[PDB]
A paper describes a structure:
Furthermore, one of the long N-terminal helical extensions of GamS inserts deeply into RecBCD. It occupies a channel that normally accommodates the nascent 3’-ssDNA tail bound to the RecB helicase subunit, increasing the extent of the steric block. The 2B and C-terminal domains of the RecC subunit together with the 2B domain of RecB move as a unit away from the RecB helicase domains. The crystal structure of the GamS protein alone revealed a pattern of negative charges on the surface that mimicked a DNA duplex, suggesting that molecular mimicry might be involved in binding. Consistent with this idea, a series of acidic side chains on Gam are located in positions equivalent to the phosphates of the DNA backbone and interact with many of the same residues on the RecBCD surface. Instead, the main component of the interaction is simply a steric block; the helix makes a snug fit in the channel involving many more contacts than the equivalent contacts with ssDNA.
In bacterial cells, the related AddAB and RecBCD enzymes are helicase-nuclease complexes responsible for initiating homologous recombination from double-stranded DNA breaks (DSBs). For example, phage λ Gam is a potent inhibitor of the Escherichia coli RecBCD complex that helps to protect the phage DNA from degradation.
Residue numbers in the entry:
A (entry chain C): 812 to 1121
B (entry chain A): 41 to 138
C (entry chain B): 5 to 289, 304 to 885
D (entry chain C): 500 to 561
E (entry chain E): 61 to 135
The structure:
């Protein structure tokens, strides 16, 4: 027992941010910042073995299978294209259930997606994709924003409301307000969830963008710890939109701790954000010292999310 | 080579189903204590001050019900708790629905 | 009931023996085994001496059959030497030598009995039928060679999907709309009937006719609803009723909901007419309209296709599984017990039972409280009335917790009524006299506390050897039983589990803090010894409770282990990392697969080391060289030698033992390396080996050999164990913090109080629900009796007035639903004040109650180390 | 491509299971061979959607 | 005596029409949307669930009867 114990996996690494950062890089970075530093920076990606092929024809659709159909159906409903064509297309591929169960599942999906579409169609206007070139902290950002209407940014996805979707719209709205683009930005999700950001001046737009780009070079140096869901759950309980200030009360802090562990530890119904390959490699067990570091770092970047959200 | 292995696996899943139902009831009561603090009795007192005066109810009658009478404040706290717990019941159900 | 002397027990016909927890019923079987060998007891002796191979002993657990075999083997050796020496130092062998006539011939019989102990027959129920049906094949009608199938879940879901294909797919959309509401598919349909598929098929109350199809029941109820749909259409638009203060004018909204629901057909769900129906309107208060009462006719009988589809599935799937296993030739453990039952029930089974009476002209069944309707009918059809063959049934009805496994207490109740002989053992050798009086006083509060008249509670008495047992904590002796009562009126289950696990973990470290200084001692007479974390045991009902005590106890820096944990090795993170290794060694040339293996926690490479590895391509080529050498050893030797060379070169085995909690990590790596060597010899293809590992990682196999092994040094760590896996063991110090918790079974399943037959009701009628809840409550009472008798010196249990009632009403508490709450309150619901007064009433000199108060001082002391 | 159940449609009826016409090796092969000739964006033909993943020389393995 | 209780009940029946269930819904939609109660969840309670409306109009009947009782006490 004379060997040395394993040192902490996290270590500071030198990094120099180039002058050209594609927008697709920042969007893929802020989606999973911990996963990024493994793949983006250190080129480390754990490949999950392909799941065993199901031994029977699907009786009910679940997971990514029904998510693709909900995305293919939502795009066809907003365009007001015939849904029976897509139904015969999916049934021809056999991806749906057989016979009547393929009809029962399709109509209860078309009933939920039509409710989401009627909200998107009302505010939707024809628009064209625009290209973006910006200078922030001496760094050039290039990319494309599809379907930009004169009213603003309009995005719709068939999923549950999450902070990862709000952060995705946040970076897309800041890059929209930094070059012209007077107007709002809206995102619609299942179960009435919505993300709506009012317009901002180019001053503040480049300020918060400078904080996001600074977090990117910070994520490339050290494995910055920000949990969009769990860190957002702790931040939602503490932050108050009326007074625009976070509560320092201890009673609300203990509730935020229970809500943070509730988002970290997953149940049988919904899998939690805490358990995953990227988060297990850093620490095998979650300590309160690192739980505070995640809270402080999430309090920094994820604060303008709930601040300007309405 | 366990003969009861199949029964032992079904019993292990039965307990995980019970604590998933218990954790859904505890989450309902957690949102119950929060929404109870969101609608204090003076909001319903103000709602009565508005619409009741046109039907002949004096302002002192509504004041004596909410502020003076203790049993009315007792039954209102139980009714607010039942209303909140039912709204929290449907809210958790909608959140539980995939 | 009469007391039992082992040497005075006549063996003829059927005899029943009840042995309380801690009575050493295993020691009694050895005495009757030596009695059956020598033919002793005179008029109470067996008619003729017998051979070891002719004595049949049945014990449900395999581990107990091997222990009883060695226990009898040692007792035959001790008695044989005692016969040659003619003198012995033991009372039992002394009384045996007094009854022995010729000791020389008896010593020769024990010598021949000692040499035959290899073929000595001690079997399980499933190990018996396997040997018996393979003995006489023609009476059973079974193939000579048959391979046992370990898991029937794969063939059950296969046959469940075959039923859902033929009986669902052709159905029209209007009928399929109703089937989709009850369950999504065969996966949910299987989970409903899965408990009903295992074991003997029970009887269904009010079964549907055999000729009724799905379309017949569908068109029948549709016509029943369509009549009320037509009648409410014509009679709508008239309000005449007696107006009551309970109702109000807002019923118009409920009236409009009835008009919107009628216009659409194919909807099996019903809008709520309950307030409008005549009986409920009579309850609120009369119009007396004809269709007003016709709604009552609709609401009285439940409208569902559930009972019909389940009945057709339960019968057909069981036939499909049995036909598929007969095609493959494989047999299950439940199918062998059903084979012998079907063989004896056949007309030619009478000759089969005659060969069993000749093979084993006697029987002794250990753990008779655990049994099935198939088992008892087999033992009854043989040994019920026979002139020369006896029967011995040993078991404690209070000890059967196994109803989840299919054990029926009513089977024992039916067996007890049929046997006229009853014998009980009154000497409890396990625990201290203070615990004996505490257990007897707790169950003597009411009459027939177990709720079944056929199971009495009788007092026992401590032996003379244990009368000196005492437990001291901080000077003056501590009482044998201590109940910890929580403070406050209403307590939630989440608040009950939290606080009590913190109070229990606080009292454990206080016993450990006083145990290292020698203050707390376990004293037998003048002898004593400090209290180690070994003798401290925590008994929880489920695994979710074990992890909740584990986190609270580890927060105080007391290492503890779960002994009953069923978690597979493949669920751990290292098992997933073992896949990224073997896959990277397979393709060392790929840069993404190799970097993924070195970034795993098993290799132990820091993020700085990975960064310096990506910066220099030369160091990367060297790692490819060593991973190529690992692939060579992988191909020439196997999985185990390569992992041995990888752990020796990387020095990860030493580094893991240096990391805190890394020895638990290393035990899993070596155990996986043993399973991969096991599956590596069968499959020569290296890629099929990686596919075998990845396949087991996705779905855990749950096999006993695939279960996580116990970590070393856990003998000195606090042992957390389930109530079920702790039966038959000895735990000097026991904790029952969560014992007050309970769960209610919503399904209706029970056994009739007359026919004693398992009866499932697919209908939700509250009758069968009340008789089903009474059997669950009696099972929880037996779960408490076993958990209370595991202790020797002291045991502590948490008590709180927990309330699962909706709205947290202040009228009464639900503690009476719990097992321990029914015994303190005498089955009478009370308040939190009444629960506290009933606790203070029964505590004298043995039971003692203290309030549960949360406190924290210091987690623990290190005790340092030795090197 | 959705290849799960038995090889042919006649094999399905031989097991006394209702004939479907999908999730079979014949359904999958035809789905894969149709995608080689026609792009999946065109539409259904026999009520079998073409499988677009292999339109090229890699389709020779099919 | 008997007339006083009849005027109190008649006055409570007139106030029952003045405070519909959608009046409590408007107050429950504005204030409780901050605490995480969705519009669909509040709409389900005040409309879909029948047992909720039964106990709702029962307590509303209890509120307008107790307030009217204090009103006659002032008279």
């Amino acid at each position: 027992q004379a060997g040395k114990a394993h040192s902490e996996f996290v270590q500071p690494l030198p990094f120099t941010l180039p002058e050209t950062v594609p927008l697709e890089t920042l969007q893929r970075f802020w989606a999973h910042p911990v996963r990024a530093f493994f793949q983006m920076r250190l080129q480390v990606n754990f490949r999950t073995e392909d799941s065993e092929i199901p031994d029977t024809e699907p009786f009910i659709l679940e997971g990514l299978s029904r998510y693709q159909i909900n995305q293919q159906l939502l795009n066809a409903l907003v365009e007001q294209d015939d849904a029976e064509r897509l139904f015969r297309r999916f049934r021809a591929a056999g991806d749906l259930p057989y016979g009547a169960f393929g009809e029962i599942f399709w109509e209860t999906q078309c009933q939920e997606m039509q409710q989401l579409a009627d909200r998107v169609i009302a505010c939707r206007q024809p628009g064209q994709s625009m290209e973006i070139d910006l200078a922030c902290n001496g760094v050039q950002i290039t990319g494309w924003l599809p379907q930009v209407q004169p009213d603003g940014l309009l995005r719709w996805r068939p999923s549950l409301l999450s902070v990862a979707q709000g952060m995705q719209l946040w970076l897309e709205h800041l890059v929209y307000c930094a070059s012209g683009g007077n107007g709002e930005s809206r995102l619609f999700l299942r179960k009435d969830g919505e993300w709506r950001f009012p317009p901002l001046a180019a001053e503040q737009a480049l300020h918060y963008l400078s904080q996001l780009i600074e977090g990117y070079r910070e994520g490339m140096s050290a494995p910055l710890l920000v949990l969009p869901e769990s860190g957002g759950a702790w931040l939602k309980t503490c932050y108050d939109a009326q007074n625009d200030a976070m509560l320092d009360d201890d009673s609300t802090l203990q509730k935020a701790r229970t809500k943070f562990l509730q988002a970290y530890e997953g149940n049988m119904m919904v899998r939690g954000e805490g358990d995953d390959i990227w988060y297990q490699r850093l620490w095998r067990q979650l300590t309160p010292e690192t739980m505070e570091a995640i809270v402080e770092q999430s309090q920094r970047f994820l604060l303008p999310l709930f601040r300007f959200n309405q | 080579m366990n003969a009861y292995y199949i029964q032992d696996r079904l019993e292990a899943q039965s307990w995980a189903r019970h604590y998933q139902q218990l954790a859904r009831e505890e989450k309902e009561a957690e949102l119950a204590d929060d929404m109870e603090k969101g609608i204090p009795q003076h909001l319903f007192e103000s709602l009565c001050i508005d619409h009741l005066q046109r039907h002949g109810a004096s302002k002192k009658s509504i004041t004596r019900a909410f502020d003076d009478d203790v049993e009315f404040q007792e039954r209102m706290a139980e009714h607010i708790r039942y209303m909140v717990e039912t709204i929290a019941h449907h809210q958790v159900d909608i959140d539980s629905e995939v | 009931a009469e007391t039992l002397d082992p040497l005075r027990l006549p063996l003829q016909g059927e005899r029943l023996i009840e042995a309380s927890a801690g009575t050493g019923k295993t020691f009694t079987i050895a005495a009757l085994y030596l009695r059956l060998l020598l033919g002793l007891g005179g008029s109470a002796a067996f008619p003729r001496p017998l051979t070891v191979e002719e004595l049949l002993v049945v014990t449900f657990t395999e581990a107990a059959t091997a222990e009883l075999r060695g226990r009898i083997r040692s007792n035959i050796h001790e008695l044989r030497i005692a016969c040659l020496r003619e003198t012995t130092d033991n009372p039992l062998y002394e009384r045996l030598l007094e009854e022995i006539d010729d000791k020389a011939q008896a010593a020769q019989w024990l010598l021949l009995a000692e040499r035959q102990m290899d073929e000595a027959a001690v079997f399980t129920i499933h190990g018996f039928c396997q040997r018996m049906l393979n003995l006489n094949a023609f009476e059973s009608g079974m193939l000579f060679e048959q391979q046992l199938i370990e898991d029937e879940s794969l063939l059950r879901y296969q046959a469940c999907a075959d039923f859902w294909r033929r009986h669902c797919y052709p159905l029209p959309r209007e009928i399929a709309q109703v089937v989709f509401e009850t369950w999504k598919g065969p996966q949910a349909l299987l989970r409903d009937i899965n408990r009903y598929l295992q074991g003997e098929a029970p009887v269904i109350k009010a079964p549907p006719p055999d000729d009724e199809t799905l379309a017949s029941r569908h068109a029948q109820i549709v016509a029943r609803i369509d009549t009320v749909k037509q009648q409410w259409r014509d009679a709508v638009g008239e309000l005449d009723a007696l107006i009551e203060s309970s109702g109000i004018d807002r019923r118009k909204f409920n009236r409009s909901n009835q008009a919107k629901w009628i216009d659409k057909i194919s909807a099996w769900a019903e809008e709520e007419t309950n307030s409008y129906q005549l009986p409920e309107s009579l309850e609120k208060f009369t119009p007396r309209h004809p269709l007003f009462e016709a709604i009552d006719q609709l609401l009285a009988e439940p409208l569902s296709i559930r009972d019909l589809v389940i009945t057709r599935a339960l019968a057909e799937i069981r036939e499909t599984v049995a036909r598929e296993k007969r095609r493959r030739g494989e047999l299950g453990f439940d199918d062998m017990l059903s084979r012998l039952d079907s063989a004896l029930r056949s007309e030619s089974g009478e000759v089969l039972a005659a060969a069993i009476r000749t093979r084993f002209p006697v029987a002794m069944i250990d753990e008779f409280q655990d049994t099935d309707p198939q088992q008892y009918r087999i033992f009854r059809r043989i040994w019920h009335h026979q002139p020369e063959t006896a029967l011995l049934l040993i078991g404690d009805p209070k000890q059967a917790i196994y109803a989840f496994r299919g054990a029926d207490i009513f089977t024992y109740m039916k067996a007890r009524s049929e046997v006229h002989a009853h014998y009980t053992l009154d000497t409890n050798w396990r625990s201290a006299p203070g615990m004996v009086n505490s257990v007897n006083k707790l169950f003597s509060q009411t009459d027939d506390a177990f709720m079944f008249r056929e199971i009495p509670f009788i007092p026992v008495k401590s032996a003379g050897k244990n009368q000196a047992l005492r437990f001291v904590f901080k000077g003056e002796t501590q009482p044998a039983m201590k109940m910890w009562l929580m403070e406050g009126e209403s307590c939630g289950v989440g608040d009950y589990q939290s606080t009590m696990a913190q109070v229990c973990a606080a009292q454990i470290r206080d016993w450990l803090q006083a145990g290292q200084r020698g203050e707390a001692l376990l004293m037998n007479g003048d002898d004593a010894r400090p209290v180690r974390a070994s003798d401290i045991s925590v008994l929880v009902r489920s695994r979710q409770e074990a992890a909740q005590v584990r986190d609270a106890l580890t927060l105080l820096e007391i290492p503890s282990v779960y002994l009953s944990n069923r978690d597979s090795v493949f669920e751990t993170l290292e098992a997933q990392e073992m896949l990224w290794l073997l896959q990277a060694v397979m393709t060392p040339e790929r840069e993404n697969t190799l970097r993924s293996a070195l970034a795993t926690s098993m290799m132990g490479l820091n993020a700085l080391d990975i960064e310096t590895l990506n910066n220099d391509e030369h160091a990367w080529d060297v790692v490819v060289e060593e991973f190529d050498g690992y692939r060579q050893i992988w191909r020439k030797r196997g999985v185990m030698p390569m992992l041995r060379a990888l752990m020796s070169a990387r020095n990860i085995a030493e580094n893991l033992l240096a990391t805190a909690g890394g020895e638990r990590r290393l035990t899993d790596i070596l155990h996986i390396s043993e399973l991969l060597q096991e599956a590596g010899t069968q499959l020569e293809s290296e890629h099929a080996l990686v596919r075998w590992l990845s396949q087991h990682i996705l779905e855990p196999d749950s096999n006993a050999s695939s279960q996580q092994m116990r970590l070393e040094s856990d003998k000195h760590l606090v042992q957390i164990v389930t109530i079920h896996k702790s039966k038959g063991l000895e735990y000097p110090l026991v904790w029952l913090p969560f014992i007050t918790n309970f769960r209610v079974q919503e399904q209706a399943f029970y056994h009739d109080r007359h026919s004693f037959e398992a009866v499932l009701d697919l209908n939700a009628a509250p009758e069968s629900v009340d008789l089903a809840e009474a059997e669950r409550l009696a099972e929880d009472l037996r779960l408490l009796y076993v958990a209370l008798t595991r202790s020797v010196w002291h045991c502590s249990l948490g008590v709180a007035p927990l309330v699962r009632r909706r709205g947290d009403k202040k009228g009464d508490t639900d503690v009476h639903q719990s097992a321990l709450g029914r015994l303190l309150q005498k089955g009478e619901p009370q308040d939190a004040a009444g629960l506290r007064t009933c606790i203070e009433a029964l505590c004298d000199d043995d039971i003692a109650w203290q309030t549960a108060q949360t406190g924290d001082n210091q987690p623990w002391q290190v005790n340092d180390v030795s090197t | 491509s959705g290849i799960r159940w038995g090889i042919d449609d006649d094999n399905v009826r031989e097991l006394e299971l209702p004939a479907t016409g999908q999730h079979t090796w014949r359904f999958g092969l035809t789905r894969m061979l149709l995608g080689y000739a026609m792009e999946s964006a065109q539409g259904e033909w026999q009520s079998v959607l073409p499988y677009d993943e292999s339109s090229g020389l890699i389709a020779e393995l099919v």
